[PDB]
Design a protein around this ligand. Structure first.
Ligand SMILES: Nc1ncnc2c1ncn2[C@@H]1O[C@H](COP(=O)(O)OP(=O)(O)OP(=O)(O)O)[C@@H](O)[C@H]1O
Ligand SMILES: Nc1ncnc2c1ncn2[C@@H]1O[C@H](COP(=O)(O)OP(=O)(O)OP(=O)(O)O)[C@@H](O)[C@H]1O
Lengths: 210, 118, 663, 239
């Protein structure tokens, strides 16, 4: 059930022995070909499904060409054929209230999307060096982040300082140190402590939080 | 002890402060974002300097005076806080996109902790 | 048969390789005569059962086929194409060129010797007892085969099949080949006898029916199939035989990944490996190793219709292991280096843990306990206390964990622990769940395996409902047991304890009362010997030096300085092990000097009687401990001088360990 | 079963039914409905003699309203004929609660609560919360209770969980083992049922356990994500 299209007569067999001769059959495994097989369930993008239900799911069988491409938590977009398989109603007798038509997708060519791959031209890569020549752009980025809230420029520079990230140089034959940065807030209520916490997730660059 | 920055958000009441607030929420019921996400994700692929004897000479002086002023005042600080004091300036040079740890980065690192502690 | 049963004509045959192993006779004269034939003689005389047929003897054999301009097909081509097919045509080449009666074994001095010849002559005389079944070739081997690839500059000479690929990229055309993979070995099973040959006896004809062994499930045959005991009105009823059935070795293991070449995404996964021949009993849990071996999948033969469509669940089959990273026996030259240079009290103090600032007092308090020694051979039933335990307290910011635990990962048999995981109930051994094999085994924690060593603990406020029992039961001598509903057996207890209790919130207030943050009064003031502290006082000159201390390690990557030559840890380990083989006996003037010491210890402790700073009220349990560490320091610095000055080193340490709080 | 028709001391029971495609997905949970169909019998082989089970084969749901905005035109004709008469704000306060003596300040707070404001997805990342949430605290015998049953029938979607919190951790989400494939998926909630409308609870003195820690995230941003053993998904909420 992998040729994706033609429902051939299956071969309910693993390995044959003794073809029409008196020779003990030998098998060359270097010239025997293989392929892989991986199922993955896809939820619903839980913003455009209207508020009357929990997210649903279906599943998709892909092949070797785009395995290990799918980290759990990626805005993926697949395209394939729609396909049913399995005997519903005859393989057991009396068959009462048992669906026997599994939904499958035997597909191809996934793409990550963004709403890691952003190729830029010579133009924008030069302009970003051209504005790098200014000696103020650390301050402009602080004020151009949260377009709703006054002040807190000590907080505002900290977020962009944390989000971009500091390195950790691992010790050779020694324990590396902390190279992560971990900031904290506290405040009396309704003072925008949770405001700026939700919009770091929109520009997160594949950093999905709980 | 495993965290570094404990920002305590104030909510003090000043008649010019809240008046400025009142219109700015009102003006929004009706330098760009995608350039910003490119700039940081380009700056995760540039080299890391770590190396200038000038910047490391000034910060330890900057530590020692507050090392006299942490214990007789508000909050005791530890040796791992120095690993912040390299790390903030280390990322601050990553904003600069350069391979020389300058002097100017060490001034914003000290001044940011000074509001965080005082 | 029709419908695409024949294949295309392939140019790669086997008969062209079959005669090329016939010219693996005595011809390789570059590497005292035929060297691979020389190894053939040291097996037939029955002392070793593993030949090694490398690629080096193939490439040099192909090196001197650079001048014979004839058609010789490639060898490392086909043996990486289908590697498993390169052992069965191999053994059918050795038998025509094996010199059999080259050994001398009379009656004994060989396992299974007179009886196989009894069996062979019972089949040889029954080869002409008509006035017939030949041996399958698997019966008379008594040997195995092995392989070994190359990753040396011969690969950079002229041309791959032995790059250390990870498990992650391996699912492609690498199935049915020979690939090596590095990893970390886990889940070591045992060694069980597998089957390779069979012998059914029917006790009428005695014709032992042989068969090849297939996969892990098979079936015996009938009794009316033979040549003599069959074909009549009476047939001998078959059953098995043990001693006439040669059995092999077998052991299963699982691999993981190095956790440094894993990508940022998914978790690593396992893989199955097997053993054959005699590479067995040569792996261990925790071996940072690599195996080279050949690849094949296996059928599942169970519930194959509804489930198990064409799933494969392969393993790899092992061929070679290249393990890595492992007393007056050519090591005495470095024992003399401590004897000639001397310098016990200070250079060895700078030797262990030179990566801190100050604190030579506490780095000296530990090296005496890393040698220990038998306290007193008591003879009678007086099991005396040994192996004193030192605890620490205080809250520095210099990451106190990697101060102590770095000592533990270089000290002998000293196992690391923490608060989570092996708690005080799972500190000893217990019975748990296991896989489908033998369940209810006695899985342990730390103290049933780290006997007579170092129990380096942290996080003393963690899981204390079980831990507070757990610390007393080892400070109490010899009651490490499992008092469960399974058994009531009790094992030994001989291990030192090194504790580091963290304070209460913020700093321990020294102006406040002590024991505000340790919760065990009865474990401390009567059943320990010495304490310390890591209190932080503001001091300008030290901290800027401490500032240069921590900043120096970043611009460079090296930390050493201050005119100390760094010492290898094996040297002091040999020095400890040699010092542990002395055990001097004290004189009389030493016990004369401690009775006056204890009186002067008694009088001043009986002056304060206050709850301000001090602890203890001069127990003899402190008196016996100060005898314990003295002979310990008399063990490491043995010049046979157990005297007043040796114990003057001892009280020198108890006065500086005490009153660490008075600053 | 509609929980009003057979009271003696019993607990209600339940049935099962299927349908065809051109009448499916026409119901949301939490509605009054009526239905007409057959009472045939199937026999599942996954209990005594050969016994079978009951189920309904439905035919047509001539329901009441949905309580997805398509309807006829003469409905809106009178509505526009009423909305031009500018007496709506004062005439509702008499006509909403025909059983309530006055209480003019409170009554106006309920009609604005039922309809709400809007929602801005304004061209940046963040958002405003377009909703209002009221409280009624006071002496017993001032009709704060029985006023709340009155908003339940008049709402499009309403639930009524007003008592004792009802295990406030299991108010928002629940996961359990499964009879088939032994899995951990999401099933239950009081909020996910009640989107677009209004919930109503009480007793905010003697719940201290989890009732406050369950509504802090559920309110003010209306974006929960369960981090239990399976999924971590940000399901929408506009409660
Ligand atoms: N300090 C502030 N400056 C400007 N606007 C603010 C501030 N605090 C709150 N707001 C406005 O209030 C709205 C919601 O604030 P928010 O709910 O994030 O408070 P909070 O950070 O969640 O506090 P808490 O977590 O204690 O509930 C935002 O739309 C924002 O415009
Ligand atoms: N302002 C009012 N107008 C009309 N009826 C009222 C009013 N206040 C109370 N009632 C009547 O009280 C009767 C019973 O209500 P009940 O005594 O249960 O109120 P309650 O629940 O005790 O008040 P509370 O919720 O403050 O405890 C109802 O039939 C209701 O008609």
């Amino acid at each position: 059930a992998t040729t994706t299209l033609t429902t051939r007569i299956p071969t309910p067999a693993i390995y044959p022995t003794e073809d029409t001769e008196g020779n003990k059959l030998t098998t060359e495994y270097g010239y025997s070909t293989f392929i892989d097989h991986q199922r993955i369930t896809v939820q619903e993008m839980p913003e455009m499904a209207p508020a009357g239900q929990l997210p649903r799911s279906i599943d998709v069988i892909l092949d070797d060409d785009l395995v290990d491409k799918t980290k759990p938590g990626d805005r993926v977009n697949v395209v394939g054929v729609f396909k049913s398989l399995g005997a519903g109603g005859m393989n057991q007798s009396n068959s009462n209230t048992l669906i026997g038509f599994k939904t499958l997708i035997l597909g191809n060519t996934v793409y990550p999307l963004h709403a890691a791959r952003q190729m830029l031209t010579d133009f924008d890569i030069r302009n970003i060096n051209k504005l790098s020549k200014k000696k103020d752009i650390f301050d402009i980025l602080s004020q151009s982040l949260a377009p709703s809230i006054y002040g807190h420029d000590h907080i505002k520079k900290a977020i962009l300082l944390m989000l971009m990230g500091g390195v950790e140089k691992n010790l050779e034959n020694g324990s590396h140190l902390r190279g992560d940065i971990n900031i904290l807030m506290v405040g009396d209520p309704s003072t925008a402590k949770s405001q700026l916490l939700r919009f770091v997730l929109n520009t997160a660059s594949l950093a999905i939080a709980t | 002890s495993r965290f570094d920055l404990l920002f305590v958000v104030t909510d003090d009441i000043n008649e010019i402060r809240d008046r400025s607030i009142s219109e700015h929420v009102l003006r929004t019921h009706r330098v760009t974002i995608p350039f910003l996400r490119k700039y940081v994700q380009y700056a995760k692929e540039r080299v890391i300097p770590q190396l200038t004897q000038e910047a490391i000479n000034v910060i330890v002086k900057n530590y020692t005076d507050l090392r006299n002023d942490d214990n007789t005042k508000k909050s005791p600080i530890t040796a791992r806080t120095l690993e912040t004091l390299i790390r903030l300036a280390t990322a601050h040079a990553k904003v600069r996109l350069s391979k020389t740890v300058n002097k100017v980065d060490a001034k914003v690192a000290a001044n940011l902790l000074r509001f965080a502690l005082l | 048969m029709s419908a695409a049963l024949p294949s295309i004509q392939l140019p790669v045959d086997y008969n062209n390789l079959f005669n090329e192993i016939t010219d693996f006779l005595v011809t390789f004269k570059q590497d005292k005569g035929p060297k691979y034939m020389a190894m053939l003689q040291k097996v037939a005389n029955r002392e070793l059962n593993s030949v090694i047929i490398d690629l080096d003897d193939i490439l040099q054999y192909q090196n001197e086929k650079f001048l014979q301009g004839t058609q010789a097909d490639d060898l490392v081509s086909a043996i990486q194409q289908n590697a498993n097919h390169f052992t069965e045509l191999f053994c059918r080449a050795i038998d025509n060129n094996m010199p059999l009666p080259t050994k001398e074994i009379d009656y004994k001095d060989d396992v299974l010797d007179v009886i196989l010849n009894q069996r062979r002559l019972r089949n040889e005389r029954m080869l002409s007892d008509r006035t017939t079944e030949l041996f399958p070739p698997n019966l008379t081997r008594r040997y195995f085969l092995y392989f070994k690839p190359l990753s040396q500059n011969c690969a950079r000479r002229y041309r791959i099949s032995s790059k250390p690929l990870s498990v992650r990229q391996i699912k492609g055309d690498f199935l049915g080949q020979l690939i090596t993979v590095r990893g970390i070995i886990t889940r070591v099973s045992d060694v069980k006898p597998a089957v390779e040959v069979i012998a059914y006896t029917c006790d009428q004809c005695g014709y032992e029916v042989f068969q090849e062994v297939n996969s892990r499930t098979f079936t015996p045959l009938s009794e009316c199939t033979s040549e003599e005991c069959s074909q009549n009105q009476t047939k001998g009823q078959l059953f098995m035989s043990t001693r006439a059935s040669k059995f092999s070795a077998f052991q299963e293991c699982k691999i993981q990944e190095l956790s440094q070449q894993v990508p940022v995404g998914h978790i690593p996964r396992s893989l199955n490996i097997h053993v054959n021949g005699t590479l067995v009993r040569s792996l261990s849990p925790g071996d940072i190793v690599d195996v080279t071996g050949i690849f094949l999948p296996a059928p599942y033969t169970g519930f194959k219709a509804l489930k198990a469509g064409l799933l494969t669940e392969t393993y790899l089959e092992a061929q070679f292991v290249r393990q890595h990273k492992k007393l007056t026996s050519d090591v005495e030259e470095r024992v003399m280096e401590l004897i000639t240079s001397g310098d016990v009290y200070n250079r060895l103090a700078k030797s262990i843990a030179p990566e801190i600032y100050g604190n030579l007092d506490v780095k000296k308090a530990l090296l005496l306990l890393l040698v220990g020694g038998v306290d007193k051979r008591v003879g009678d039933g007086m099991k005396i206390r040994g192996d004193i335990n030192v605890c620490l307290m205080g809250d520095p910011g210099v990451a106190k964990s990697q101060l102590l635990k770095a000592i533990c990962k270089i000290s002998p048999r000293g196992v690391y622990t923490t608060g989570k995981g092996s708690s005080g109930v799972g500190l000893t051994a217990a019975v748990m769940k296991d896989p489908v094999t033998d369940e209810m085994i006695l899985e342990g924690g730390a103290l049933v395996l780290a006997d007579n060593g170092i129990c380096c603990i942290d996080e003393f406020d963690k899981m204390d409902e079980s831990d507070r029992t757990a610390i007393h039961e080892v400070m109490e001598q010899q009651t490490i047991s499992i008092s469960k509903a399974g058994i009531n057996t009790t094992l030994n207890a001989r291990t030192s304890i090194l504790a580091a209790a963290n304070p209460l919130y913020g700093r321990y207030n020294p102006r406040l009362s002590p024991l505000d943050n340790i919760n065990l009064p009865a474990a401390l003031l009567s059943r320990f010997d010495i304490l310390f502290l890591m209190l932080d006082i503001p001091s300008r000159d030290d901290d800027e030096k401490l500032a240069e201390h921590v900043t120096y390690v970043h611009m460079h990557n090296k930390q050493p300085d201050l005119d100390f030559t760094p010492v290898e840890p094996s040297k002091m380990r040999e020095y400890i092990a040699y010092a542990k083989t002395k055990r001097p006996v004290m004189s009389e003037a030493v016990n004369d000097y401690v009775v006056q010491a204890y009186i002067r210890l008694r009088q001043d402790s009986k002056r304060e009687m206050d709850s301000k700073f001090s602890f203890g009220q001069a127990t003899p349990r402190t008196l016996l401990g100060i005898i314990r560490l003295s002979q310990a320091l008399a063990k490491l610095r043995l010049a046979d001088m157990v005297d007043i000055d040796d114990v003057e080193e001892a009280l020198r340490l108890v006065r500086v360990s005490k009153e660490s709080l008075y600053q | 079963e509609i929980p009003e028709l057979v009271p003696v001391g019993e607990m209600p029971r339940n049935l099962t039914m299927t349908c065809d495609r051109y009448l499916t997905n026409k119901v949301i949970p939490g509605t009054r409905v009526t239905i007409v169909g057959i009472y045939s019998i199937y026999n599942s082989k996954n209990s005594g003699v050969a016994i079978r089970t009951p189920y309904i084969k439905i035919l047509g749901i001539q329901s009441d309203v949905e309580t997805v905005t398509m309807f006829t035109e003469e409905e809106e004709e009178e509505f526009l004929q009423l909305s031009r008469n500018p007496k709506l704000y004062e005439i509702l306060t008499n006509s909403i609660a025909p059983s309530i003596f006055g209480n003019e300040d409170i009554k106006k707070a309920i009609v604005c609560l039922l309809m709400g404001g809007s929602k801005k997805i304004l061209p940046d990342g963040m958002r405003l919360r377009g909703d209002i949430n009221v409280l009624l605290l006071g002496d017993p015998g001032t009709a704060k209770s029985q006023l709340l049953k009155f908003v339940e029938k008049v709402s499009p979607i309403a639930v009524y969980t007003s008592g004792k919190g009802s295990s406030a951790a299991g108010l928002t989400a629940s996961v359990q083992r499964d009879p088939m494939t032994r899995e951990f998926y999401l099933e239950g909630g009081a909020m996910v049922l009640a989107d677009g409308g209004v919930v109503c609870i009480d007793e905010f003195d003697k719940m201290r356990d989890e009732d406050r820690v369950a509504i802090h995230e559920a309110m003010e941003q209306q974006t929960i994500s369960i981090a239990k053993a399976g999924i971590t998904t940000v399901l929408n909420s506009r409660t």
